[PDB]
Design a protein around this ligand. Structure first.
Ligand SMILES: COc1cc(-c2cncc(-c3ccc(C4CCN(C)CC4)cc3)c2C)cc(OC)c1OC
Ligand SMILES: COc1cc(-c2cncc(-c3ccc(C4CCN(C)CC4)cc3)c2C)cc(OC)c1OC
Ligand SMILES: COc1cc(-c2cncc(-c3ccc(C4CCN(C)CC4)cc3)c2C)cc(OC)c1OC
Ligand SMILES: COc1cc(-c2cncc(-c3ccc(C4CCN(C)CC4)cc3)c2C)cc(OC)c1OC
Lengths: 284, 294
C-alpha cells in the first residue's frame, strides 16, 4: 500500500525558542506541525514517550496524530503532528474577545475536564499524568467553545522547567515534595487557578470587563526572574487581585472563591481537578 | 518527497514485520513493530537521534514514526534495505573463502567497536552496548561487509558525565546467544562494562557461525546455530542455562580448523570471547585489532 507521509507546511502560526508550529495539510485536512529546535529535543522525546505509553484520547486534550523523526545531512528533524485548532490559543483569544457567563464557564469547565483526565489513574486505562506547564498559551480554543490542553513535553507519569510566572510557591522555594506524585498535581492546580483568573477578567458583568493581563502583571516585570517570582509568591505571599465588580455578579463571586482554593500556600489544601469540575457544574 | 510504497513483506515474527518498500526511487526497509514491543521502538529511536552513530557497519537510519488515530498506534522504523538479507540467511546458502570470511568478521568487529567506544564533541555518541547481537541482526552488504542492526535493547553510557541509561524494556536477549551471567541472572545491572561483555560473548558465537562456512582443504561445515546439538528446538531460557551454566558447554571447534592458520587464529579468538569470567573476555577494540592482523 502507499503510505502518504507528505505534509504541505502552509503557514507558520508560532515561532519561539521551542522551535516553530505550522498549519499543515495532510490528505486535504489541516494538521498542526510542531518542529522542535535542537535546544528542545527532550520535549519531543518526553511527549513521544508518554503517547507510546498511553494513547490519550479526550475532547479537552490536543489530539495526537504522529511523532516523526527524519535523518538530515548532519542533524535530526523532530516533528509532532496534532489536530489543528484554527482559533489558536486561549492567550491569543482573550486579548480581543470578551465572554458571557455561558462562554466563560464553558472554557473553564473544559480545561478542568482535560486536567482531571490527565490527573486520574485508570486501571486496565492510563497512568496519572501531571502537566507541569499549564498556562493560557498551552490551551487551544475549539470552534464548539470548549478548549483543549496542549504540550506534554514536561509531563510526568505515575502508576526545561515550567513557565516561571505560573510556578507554584513550593516550586519557587524548592520545598516541593518531588517523591510524592500528588505534589505535581497540586502545582498544576495552582497554575489552573491563574488561568481561571485570566479568563474571568474577560467575562462581562453590568457592562464592565477587565483588559487582558497575565497573572502578576502588576508586581513583576515581563519575563520575570525566578527571584522576582519567589519574592512575590513566597516571601510577600501576594495573589492576583479580585476586582470589586466581581462581587456584584454571582458567577464571578463563585469563580473568585474557586481560584482562592487553588492558591493556598499549603499544596495539600488546594482543590482537586475533580472537585473544581463539580463546583463549576453547580455554578448557574 | 516523504511518501513510501510497501512492495513485499520480507519477514513476520516476534519483532513485528519488515517490508521492502520504495522511497524516492530507492528500496527502503520498513519495520512495523509488535504493539507490545513499543519500548524497543522508542529505544531505537533514541539511539538513531545520534548523528555520530552513523557508520558503514551500522544499519543506516532514514526515519522513525509513531502514528495514531482513535485507539490504534503504529510504530515504524525506516532504514536502508540490504537485498542480500541477514548474515543468518547468507550463511545458509554460501560458503566462504579466507578473504570473504575475514571481511565479514572484521566488518562486524568494526561496527561493534564503533558502538562500544564513546565519541566526544558537540555532536557526540555515547558508549553503546547492543544486548541482542546475533546473525539475524547483522545484514550483508553488496561490498562483502556487514552492518549491525536492531538497537531496541541497547544501553548507553557517557564516562564524560558519569551517566548510565539502561532503559525499561521487558524484552530479553535472544536466548540461544545469552551469556552465562544473563542465563544465571547474576549480571551486574548497574555496570556498563557488564553489557559490553555480553556483546562479546554473542560476538564469539557469531564468529563461530561464520567460521564453520569458511572452506579449508576442501572441507566446510553445514550452517548450524549456536548450541544446535545440545538443546531442544526453540530452546527455553532454562534449556540454555542448563547447557551454558550447569554443563559449561561452548560451541565445539571442528578439528579440521587446526590445519588452517586463519581458522586456528579465529578459534583462539572465539575462545577468548567465551570465558565464564566476563572480565577475562577480549574487548571489541582488541578483537578488531586482532582481525586486522589475521
Ligand atoms: C510512517 O509515517 C507516517 C505514516 C502515515 C500513514 C499514512 N498512510 C497510512 C498509514 C497507516 C495507518 C495504519 C495502518 C494499519 C492498517 C491495518 N493493519 C492491520 C495495521 C496497520 C496502515 C497504514 C499511516 C500510519 C501518516 C504520516 O503522517 C500523517 C506519517 O508520518 C508521520
Ligand atoms: C501550544 O502548543 C501547541 C499548539 C499547536 C497548535 C494547534 N492548533 C492550532 C495552532 C494555531 C493555529 C493558528 C494560530 C493563529 C493563525 C491565524 N490567526 C490570525 C490567529 C491564530 C495560532 C495557533 C497551534 C499553535 C500545536 C502543537 O503541537 C503540534 C503545540 O504543541 C504541543
Ligand atoms: C495517523 O493519523 C491518521 C491515520 C489515518 C489512517 C490511514 N490509513 C489507515 C488507517 C487505519 C486503517 C485500519 C486500522 C485497523 C487496525 C486494526 N483494527 C482491528 C481495524 C482498524 C488502523 C488504521 C488510518 C487510521 C487516517 C487519518 O485521518 C483520516 C489520520 O489522521 C490524520
Ligand atoms: C534486523 O533488524 C532490521 C533489519 C532490517 C532489514 C534491512 N534490509 C534487509 C532486510 C532483509 C531482507 C530480506 C531478507 C530475506 C533473506 C532471504 N529470504 C527472502 C528471507 C528474508 C532478510 C532480511 C532486513 C530484515 C530492517 C530493519 O528495520 C527497518 C531492522 O530493524 C532495525
Amino acid at each position: 500500500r502507499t503510505v502518504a507521509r507528505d505534509i504541505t507546511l502552509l503557514e507558520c502560526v508560532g515561532k519561539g525558542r521551542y522551535g516553530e508550529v505550522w498549519r499543515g495539510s495532510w490528505q486535504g485536512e489541516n494538521v498542526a506541525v510542531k518542529i522542535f529546535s535542537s535546544r528542545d529535543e527532550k520535549s519531543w522525546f518526553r511527549e513521544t514517550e508518554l503517547y507510546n505509553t498511553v494513547m490519550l484520547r479526550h475532547e479537552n486534550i490536543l489530539g495526537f496524530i504522529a511523532s516523526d523523526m527524519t535523518s538530515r545531512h548532519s542533524s535530526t528533524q523532530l516533528w509532532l503532528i496534532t489536530h489543528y485548532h484554527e482559533m489558536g490559543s486561549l492567550y491569543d483569544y482573550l486579548q480581543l474577545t470578551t465572554l458571557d457567563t455561558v462562554s466563560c464557564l464553558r472554557i473553564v469547565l473544559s480545561i478542568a475536564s482535560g486536567l482531571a483526565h490527565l490527573h486520574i489513574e485508570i486501571f486496565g486505562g492510563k497512568p496519572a499524568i501531571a502537566h507541569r506547564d499549564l498556562k493560557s498559551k498551552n490551551i487551544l480554543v475549539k470552534k464548539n467553545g470548549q478548549c483543549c490542553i496542549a504540550d506534554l513535553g514536561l509531563a510526568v507519569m505515575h502508576s526545561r522547567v515550567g513557565t516561571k510566572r505560573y510556578m507554584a510557591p513550593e516550586v519557587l522555594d524548592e520545598t516541593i515534595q518531588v517523591d510524592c506524585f500528588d505534589s505535581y498535581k497540586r502545582v498544576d492546580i495552582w497554575a489552573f487557578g491563574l488561568v481561571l483568573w485570566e479568563v474571568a477578567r474577560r467575562m462581562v458583568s453590568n457592562g464592565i470587563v477587565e483588559d487582558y493581563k497575565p497573572p502578576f502583571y502588576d508586581v513583576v516585570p515581563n519575563d520575570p526572574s525566578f527571584e522576582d517570582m519567589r519574592k512575590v509568591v513566597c516571601v510577600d505571599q501576594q495573589r492576583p487581585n479580585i476586582p470589586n465588580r466581581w462581587f456584584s455578579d454571582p458567577t464571578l463571586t463563585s469563580l473568585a472563591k474557586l481560584m482562592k482554593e487553588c492558591w493556598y500556600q499549603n499544596p495539600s489544601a488546594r482543590l482537586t481537578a475533580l472537585r473544581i469540575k463539580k463546583t463549576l457544574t453547580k455554578i448557574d
